[PDB]
């Protein structure tokens with residue numbers, strides 16, 4: 235259907251996250267427990283947010299690097315719907331996380347932050363991974379790296395390989411038309427919703443512009 | 449200089465970790481807050497362990513993939529000595545974590561878990577990274593991957609580039625002779641200490657073996 239809207243809670247404490255969710259939880263489709271929040275509070279963040287918003291998809295952005303079955307199980311036992319595994323993880327890490335996800339009727343996303351290869355991407359596909367997150371790194375953004383046509387070419391290629399593609403990384407309202415034409419599964423916004431003068435209006439403008447374009 | 453011993457606390461809760469540390473905190477050199485414990489409890493795990501063992505090096509094995517400044521600052525504000533950054537991270541992630549670490553007189557290790565390249569490795573050195581963790585993935589080990597020739601070659605080349613190398617990934621006592629003659633900085637043991645009948649005796653065994661092999 236239309237691309238979904240995910241909010242990233244990149245906060246260090248639950249009470250800080252709740253300053254955002256109390257405004258916009260009903261305005262988005264997916265609530266992400268950001269990596270920062272996973273490190274700040276641990277898996278209780280996932281458990282708490284799913285208890286609050288059980289009708290929403292909750293994503294634990296754990297960026298699992300290894301110990302796929304152990305870490306995925308902690309997240310899913312805390313009631314996560316989706317978990318992320320980082321792109322450089324050994325293929326057996328992705329496979330282990332996916333096996334656990336199936337036990338809980340969840341799913342795994344590969345987080346494409348940093349270095350990866352097209353040969354690894356075929357591997358994830360062969361392993362049964364259906365979701366990837368195309369991510370312009372925060373630190374790369376801060377060093378002046380922009381979105382460009384090489385990103386759009388890569389998103390299209392991933393989509394043609396059969397992945398559902400999430401797009402993220404300092405996304406602004408004005409960036410949405412760059413992706414016009416592509417069956418994007420999810421757009422993530424963290425800062426552009428959380429730090430907006432009006433987070434509710436920020437979220438609604440995202441949803442309005444997605445409905446315009448798709 | 450003898451390889452040091454690091455215990456990995458890959459427990460899901462602090463009380464489980466303390467079942468280990470009450471036994472071996474004084475038998476090891478470095479206490480690692482494992483990724484599993486960081487995800488289970490959050491960075492309070494680092495703060496609490498450092499408060500218990502302030503004379504020991506405490507390593508937060510956060511395996512930072514992005515947001516280097518923010519995640520490293522969280523670990524260091526919790527009184528970590530060392531933090532880890534995963535090999536695939538953008539170079540600016542490592543630089544950002546290293547800048548923070550210097551403010552707190554700490555350090556950063558690159559974690560070689562999964563795929564990375566030798567051009568990647570030079571960038572780490574230029575950037576001022578002085579430590580790497582040569583890691584045999586747990587999931588790879590479970591799928592039959594053993595310690596081998598290519599591993600030894602890679603570790604020697606890393607060391608010659610000027611990195612202090614930590615070795616880890618399912619290490620058992622019988623694995624240590626494979627590394628003899630290489631100036632390994634640290635060996636990490638998790639399961640082979642925590643899950644032993646006597647964690648104290650397992651740690652002492654590692655220490656005796658090391659003292660024989662490198663002495």
Ligand SMILES: CC(O)[C@H](O)[C@@H](O)COP(=O)(O)O
Pocket residue numbers: 242243244268269295369372402403404405422423424425426514
């Ligand atoms: C980097 C990361 O994982 C963040 O959650 C990111 O996906 C979305 O947040 P930003 O929109 O603030 O870049």
Ligand SMILES: CC(O)[C@H](O)[C@@H](O)COP(=O)(O)O
Pocket residue numbers: 300301456457458482483509583586616617618619636637638639640
């Ligand atoms: C995988 C990881 O980070 C672990 O802490 C590892 O380095 C040491 O633990 P094991 O000796 O149980 O393989």
Ligand SMILES: [Mg+2]
Pocket residue numbers: 242266267268269295
């Ligand atoms: Mg995130």
Ligand SMILES: [Mg+2]
Pocket residue numbers: 456480482483509
């Ligand atoms: Mg570890």
